């Protein structure tokens, strides 16, 4: 149900949660995966918005702090479900990195959203800008 790059986001999200010593894979780890994957549309959008992996990493560690089997948080699961809806609405059968980013922005209320707020990003403006990119 995913593009080639979307599972790489998920792999990195889990790796980051483990590297940071965290107990679950939350929306902020999905955000880290989106930016660190580097090549997908989501990474491109985050780059164009003036963000980068190190800035996001530092803000995650500031807000949450550092700490085997880690599970997705309920909100991260919701974001993944929303990514499927975002893809469908845009005429795609496969969920790409951009749909995970849109699902994260749409949910708009977890640790990733707090991080984005603290990094100076408006979610509503960012949603419009990501869609603008997809329409280009």
Q: What is the CATH superfamily label?
A: Clp, N-terminal domain
CATH class: Mainly Alpha
Secondary-structure content class: mainly alpha
Strand content: under 5%
Helical region count? 8
General form: globular
Biggest sheet record: 2 strands, parallel
CATH fold-level name:
Double Clp-N motif
CATH architecture: Orthogonal Bundle
Q: Separation of termini?
A: 24 Å
The number of distinct structural domains comes to 1
**Percent helix:** 55-70%
Q: Looking across the biggest beta sheet, what order are the strands in? A: 1-2
Total strand segments: 2
Rg from C-alpha positions?
13 Å
Order of helices and strands: HEHHHEHHHH
Summarize the structure.
The PDB classes it as chaperone. This protein is mainly alpha-helical and 136 residues long.
Can you put this structure into words, describing what you see?
There is one protein chain. The protein is mostly helical and about 140 residues long. The chain has eight helices and two strands. It has helices spanning about 5-20, 25-35, 40-50, 55-65, 75-90, 95-105, 110-120, 125-135; strands at about 25, 70. The chain has a two-stranded parallel sheet. It is globular and about 40 Å long.
Offer a few descriptive terms.
mainly alpha, chaperone, monomeric, Double Clp-N motif, two-stranded parallel sheet, Sporulation, 136 residues, monomer
């Amino acid at each position: 149900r995913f593009t080639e790059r979307a599972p790489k986001v998920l792999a990195l999200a889990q790796e980051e949660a483990l590297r940071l010593g965290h107990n679950n894979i939350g929306t902020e780890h999905i955000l880290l995966g989106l930016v660190r994957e580097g090549e997908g549309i989501a990474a491109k959008a985050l780059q164009a918005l003036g963000l980068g992996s190190e800035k996001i990493q530092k803000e995650v560690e500031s807000l949450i702090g550092r700490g085997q089997t880690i599970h997705y948080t309920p909100r991260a699961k919701k974001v993944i479900e929303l990514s499927m809806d975002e893809a469908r609405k845009l005429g795609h059968s496969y969920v790409g990195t951009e749909h995970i980013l849109l699902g994260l922005i749409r949910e708009g209320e977890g640790v990733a959203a707090r991080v984005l707020n603290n990094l100076g990003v408006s979610l509503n403006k960012a949603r419009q800008q990501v869609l603008q990119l997809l329409g280009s």
